[PDB]
Design a protein around this ligand. Structure first.
Ligand SMILES: *[C@@H]1O[C@H](CO)[C@@H](O[C@@H]2O[C@H](CO)[C@@H](O)[C@H](O)[C@H]2NC(C)=O)[C@H](O)[C@H]1NC(C)=O
Ligand SMILES: *[C@@H]1O[C@H](CO)[C@@H](O[C@@H]2O[C@H](CO)[C@@H](O)[C@H](O)[C@H]2NC(C)=O)[C@H](O)[C@H]1NC(C)=O
Ligand SMILES: *[C@@H]1O[C@H](CO)[C@@H](O)[C@H](O)[C@H]1NC(C)=O
Ligand SMILES: *[C@@H]1O[C@H](CO)[C@@H](O)[C@H](O)[C@H]1NC(C)=O
Lengths: 190, 188
């Protein structure tokens, strides 16, 4: 029971400090016996007493996201930010634990986009403004977004299948339905 | 200007800050002010400090950061620089491939990306497969998990014929192409 990564787990038992809050995970370090451990988690549990825990959300959405690498489709696909492990630019890779995985590296904060398999179809059952989204993965996210908006905390998580009926404000020619790695233009009403 | 001083290292005091497998991160000085820079073009940087291992060309196959640390050993094809956000809310101006922005530079272990289909065509050599891809350029590599093979990645357009070597026929090498991986079988 080698418990190196465990130090990040009991943080209800240690002096803790949040260093950063992203849309989908938290960046914090904890002290034990004078040694500092860096941690990244997608779970907000037990971090209430940490310093800088003021804006710690109720829970984190667990939808699959990946970094946006082409900067010009940032406005289109952005759904917030997340913390990632990366390599040090000065080779000072320090020990750090990511979602209870021990590793070496540093912390990167990056704007992210939805990802994963999501099937989009137009439904027979209601109307051309009702769509069905399905996914073989445990959790899949979708977001309806006009480019440039800040609707980052409106990612909806679903398991297996869901149905959406577009509102009228969405039925201009500028709203896109983002689901997993997919983007589909939402039609104009008339 | 935002990209001007930075597409202009040949005439200025340049300094390379890092060289990844697929691009270079440098900075330039003009009239006393420093400008950060990220380019996948090696040209014009010869005069920069720390230029010894600056390659002739950077491969331009699409690559994206590995987000699940577990399957790093299997898919890794080197490292690349990317723009990120300041953790301390101090975002400075950077030019990425002549695209100007605010942010921070990140260095991330990277994997192959894009659409690639592994179809084993009927040929005369048992060890020859055909790969297809609709993208303008696509990349592939033969590696065994953990193999430190970077700069062994191959560009191709439309299609390509891969003729396996002997060593690759241990059941431990994978055909990485785009976002696809396939296991090279044991044959005797
Ligand atoms: C992270 O890096 C450390 C080294 O800083 C690795 O831990 C061992 O550290 C000793 C120093 O006492 C080195 O001599 C060893 O080479 C390292 N062990 C091994 C097996 O490589 C550690 O393994 C690295 N990875 C993780 C997940 O901690
Ligand atoms: C993001 O980048 C823009 C680039 O135009 C910044 O805008 C100006 O940047 C120059 C230096 O690059 C400063 O001297 C100006 O004071 C900036 N402000 C304006 C209004 O032009 C901008 O400050 C950067 N940051 C943000 C949050 O947009
Ligand atoms: C660490 O402490 C937490 C309670 O804050 C508990 O969930 C966990 O089981 C503890 N682990 C060990 C090894 O004591
Ligand atoms: C960059 O360098 C050239 C070198 O002749 C210089 O004249 C000018 O400042 C810049 N030119 C361009 C096209 O950016």
């Amino acid at each position: 029971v080698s418990d190196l990564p465990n130090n990040c787990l009991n943080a209800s038992s240690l002096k803790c400090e949040i260093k950063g809050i992203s849309t989908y995970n938290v960046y914090y370090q904890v002290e034990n016996n004078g040694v500092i451990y860096s941690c990244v988690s997608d779970s907000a549990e037990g971090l209430e007493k940490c310093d800088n825990s003021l804006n710690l959300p109720k829970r984190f959405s667990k939808v699959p996201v990946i970094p946006i690498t082409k900067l010009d489709n940032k406005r289109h696909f952005s759904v917030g930010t997340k913390f990632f492990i990366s390599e040090s630019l000065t080779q000072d890779n320090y020990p750090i634990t990511y979602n209870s995985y021990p590793t070496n590296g540093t912390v990167c904060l990056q704007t992210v986009k939805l990802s994963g398999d999501c099937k989009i179809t137009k439904s027979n059952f209601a109307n051309p403004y009702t769509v069905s989204i399905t996914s073989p993965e445990k959790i899949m996210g979708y977001l309806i977004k006009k480019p440039g908006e800040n609707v980052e905390h409106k990612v909806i998580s679903f398991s297996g299948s869901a149905s959406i009926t577009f509102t009228e404000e969405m039925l201009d020619g500028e709203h896109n339905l983002l689901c997993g790695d997919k983007s589909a233009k939402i039609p104009k009403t008339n």
